[PDB]
Amino acid sequence: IESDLERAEERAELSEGKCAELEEELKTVTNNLKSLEAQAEKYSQKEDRYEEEIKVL
Amino acid sequence: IESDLERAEERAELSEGKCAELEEELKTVTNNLKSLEAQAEKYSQKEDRYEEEIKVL
C-alpha cells in the first residue's frame, strides 16, 4: 500500500502540473480570441458602412 | 496509510477530471478560433471587393 501511495502521489503531481499549464494556455488563447473578436467586429462595422455608401451611390 | 492512499487517489481523480474538462474547453475554443479567423478573412476580402465596387460605381 505504501508503494501504491507513492504511485498515486506522483500521478497526481503530474496531473496537477498539466492542469495548471493547460489553464495558462487557456487564458492566453482567450486573450487572443477576444482580440480577434474585436478585430472582426471592427471589420463588420467598416463593411456595413461600405454597403450603406454603396446603396446610396 | 490506507487513509492517505484514499485521499491521494481522490485528489488524483479530481485533478484529472478538471484537466479533461479544461482540454475539452480548449478544443471547443480552438474550433471557435478557427471559425472566427475564417470569418474575419472573409470580411476583409469582402471589404476590399466592395472598395473597388464602390469606386467603379
From Swiss-Prot, chains A, B:
Disease / disorder: Cardiomyopathy, familial hypertrophic, 3: A hereditary heart disorder characterized by ventricular hypertrophy, which is usually asymmetric and often involves the interventricular septum. The symptoms include dyspnea, syncope, collapse, palpitations, and chest pain. They can be readily provoked by exercise. The disorder has inter- and intrafamilial variability ranging from benign to malignant forms with high risk of cardiac failure and sudden cardiac death. Cardiomyopathy, dilated, 1Y: A disorder characterized by ventricular dilation and impaired systolic function, resulting in congestive heart failure and arrhythmia. Patients are at risk of premature death.
Domain of life assignment: Eukaryota
Locations listed in the record: Cytoplasm, Cytoskeleton
Gene: TPM1
Residue numbers of the full-length protein present here: 172 to 228 of 284
Location, primary (coarse class): cytoplasm
Organism: Homo sapiens (Human)
Function comment: Binds to actin filaments in muscle and non-muscle cells. Plays a central role, in association with the troponin complex, in the calcium dependent regulation of vertebrate striated muscle contraction. Smooth muscle contraction is regulated by interaction with caldesmon. In non-muscle cells is implicated in stabilizing cytoskeleton actin filaments.
Notes concerning its domains: The molecule is in a coiled coil structure that is formed by 2 polypeptide chains. The sequence exhibits a prominent seven-residues periodicity.
Residues recorded as bearing Phosphoserine in the entry: 3, 15, 35
Gene Ontology MF terms in the entry: actin binding; actin filament binding; cytoskeletal protein binding; identical protein binding; protein heterodimerization activity; protein homodimerization activity; structural constituent of cytoskeleton; structural constituent of muscle
Entry protein name: Tropomyosin alpha-1 chain
Keywords, sorted A to Z: Acetylation, Actin-binding, Cardiomyopathy, Coiled coil, Cytoplasm, Cytoskeleton, Disease variant, Muscle protein, Phosphoprotein
GO cellular component terms attached to this protein's record: actin cytoskeleton; actin filament; bleb; cytoskeleton; cytosol; muscle thin filament tropomyosin; ruffle membrane; sarcomere
Tissues with expression: Detected in primary breast cancer tissues but undetectable in normal breast tissues in Sudanese patients. Isoform 1 is expressed in adult and fetal skeletal muscle and cardiac tissues, with higher expression levels in the cardiac tissues. Isoform 10 is expressed in adult and fetal cardiac tissues, but not in skeletal muscle.
